[PDB]
């Protein structure tokens, strides 16, 4: 026989181990493969699909109403319209998104984000918005001439309905962490703010109030690392009829 000795970790059950194991049904022939539409091979393909942000996460916004932001004509120049918290770990407009939900199975992330906004007013409605990303370090800007100093796009409503703001990967480290300490220097991304560049201008027969839908996706420079249990789901009890499977 072969002389052998057992190492530390002999007999352990590691849930991420990767070995062959004994086939319980010998000579079983699985059903032939068939082409099915929509095969996924990397989860990064899913986070590249844009999905609606819950920007109007306010009391008295119910259900579908939380997925849109209403804009009205103002009488003061350059007013703030809304801001978007960029925390994916803490609860906020980005959490329940395809990029958000998949990323919360991971601990580390890197790469650029795109926010796309679709204007859903009438054809006769006109306006210009400025959308700003502020890199981290200070407070969220409350005035347009402060927010204008960051990365921004000036959006004119027109035949093309939608504009993209890229949030470029601007970070000291290779990765950020999905950290519950949102103010940590390893976690904070900064802010997105929207201001009036001009005004929403509508004729009498159009509705005086118009909506934006915001979407977010990852770009293909995006990467995720260190898999973890997602905090999005849990159970305190057995589910209904889970017991009946033993009966």
């Amino acid at each position: 026989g072969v002389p052998t000795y057992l190492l530390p970790g002999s007999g352990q059950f590691l849930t991420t181990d990767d070995h062959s194991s004994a086939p319980a049904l010998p000579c079983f022939n699985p059903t032939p493969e068939m082409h099915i539409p929509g095969q996924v091979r990397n989860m990064l393909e899913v986070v590249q699909v844009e999905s609606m942000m819950e920007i109007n996460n306010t009391e008295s916004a119910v259900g579908m109403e939380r997925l849109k932001v209403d804009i009205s004509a103002l009488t003061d120049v350059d007013q703030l319209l809304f801001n978007i918290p960029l925390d994916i770990q803490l609860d906020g407009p980005l959490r329940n998104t395809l990029v958000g939900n998949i990323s919360r199975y991971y601990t580390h992330w890197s790469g650029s984000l795109e926010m796309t906004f679709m204007f859903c007013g009438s054809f006769m409605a006109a306006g210009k918005l400025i959308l700003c990303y502020t890199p981290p370090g200070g407070s969220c800007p409350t005035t347009r001439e402060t927010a204008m100093l960051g990365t921004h796009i000036v959006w004119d409503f027109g035949l093309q309905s939608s504009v993209t703001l890229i949030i470029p990967w601007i970070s000291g480290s290779h990765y950020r962490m999905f950290n519950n300490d949102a103010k940590s220097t390893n976690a904070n991304v900064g802010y997105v703010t929207c201001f009036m560049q001009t005004n929403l201008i509508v004729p009498s027969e159009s509705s005086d109030t118009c909506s934006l839908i915001g979407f977010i996706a990852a770009k293909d420079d995006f990467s995720l690392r260190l898999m973890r249990d997602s905090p999005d789901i849990g159970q305190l009890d057995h589910l209904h009829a889970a017991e009946a499977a033993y009966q």
Binding site: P32, M34, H35, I36, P37, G38, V46, V49, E50, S51, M52, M53, E54, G63, M64, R66, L67, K68, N96, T97, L98, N101, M118, F119, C120, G121, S122, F123, M124, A125, L159, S161, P203, S204, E205, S206, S207, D208, T209, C210, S211, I213, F215, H240, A241
Partner: protein, 238 residues
């Protein structure tokens, strides 16, 4: 280019002057079942233009309080024309679908419809342990209404529903949506009366609004089955 479209299938044709391109679901096109994937050995009937043509459903009124609408395929077409007759006389069915959704308003109207085709849209019930019954699911040609579109009536997420094949009708931009659906099943064919491959959902994420004089703003659905095959001829269940 992308704004005008004509669709011609059989004796039916549709033109639109305000398309927004169109969606081919997962980049596939409908096809007939090849011999290397086939299971049932009887020779299929392929009725072509008798089945592979646009059928128009009853229109629904878009209202300020609308939650959105749904139709299940093949269930909504199982009683219509020669598609319905072949469904009733055959045990097995396979097809793709061409879906065209129509809604127009004035340049003073605003509103946005998400038009999404969901594969295997297994519904949940709200606030009960009891599963949805047969009459909750099998609405036929009339379709159903969303109870809680915000969770797609399945404990999930309207916001992430863009992961499915979809377009929008944004009344400012366009007045029709087009989705081409391939066959989408774990089996190569199915019994058309007990399983729905696809659900068309139309959800008003931005509500209809205007300050002009109000009019009825209907939403109309036209569906063409594509590459229909039927196997297992018998008497009609009907």
């Amino acid at each position: 280019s992308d704004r005008v479209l004509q669709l011609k299938l059989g004796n039916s044709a549709i033109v639109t002057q305000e398309a927004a391109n169109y969606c081919c679901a997962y980049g596939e096109w409908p096809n007939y079942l090849p011999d290397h994937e086939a299971v049932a050995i009887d020779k299929p009937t392929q009725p072509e233009t008798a089945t592979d043509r646009f059928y128009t459903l009853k229109s629904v009124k878009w209202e300020t309080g609308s939650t959105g609408w749904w139709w299940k395929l093949p269930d909504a077409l199982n009683n219509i024309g020669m598609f319905g007759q072949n469904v009733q006389h055959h045990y097995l069915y396979r097809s793709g679908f061409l879906i065209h959704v129509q809604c127009n308003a004035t340049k003073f109207h605003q509103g946005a419809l998400l038009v999404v085709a969901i594969p295997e849209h297994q519904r949940g019930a709200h606030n009960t342990n009891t599963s949805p019954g047969f009459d909750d699911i099998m609405k036929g040609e009339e379709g159903g209404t969303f109870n809680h579109p915000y969770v797609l009536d399945d404990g999930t997420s309207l916001a992430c529903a863009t992961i499915f094949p979809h377009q929008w009708i944004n009344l400012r931009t366009n007045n029709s949506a087009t989705i081409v659906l391939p066959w989408m099943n774990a089996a190569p064919m199915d019994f058309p009366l007990r399983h729905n491959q696809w659900t068309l959902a139309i959800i008003p994420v931005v509500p209809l609004g205007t300050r002009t004089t109000s009019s009825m703003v209907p939403i109309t659905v036209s569906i063409a089955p594509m590459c229909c095959e039927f196997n297992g001829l018998r008497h009609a269940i009907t």
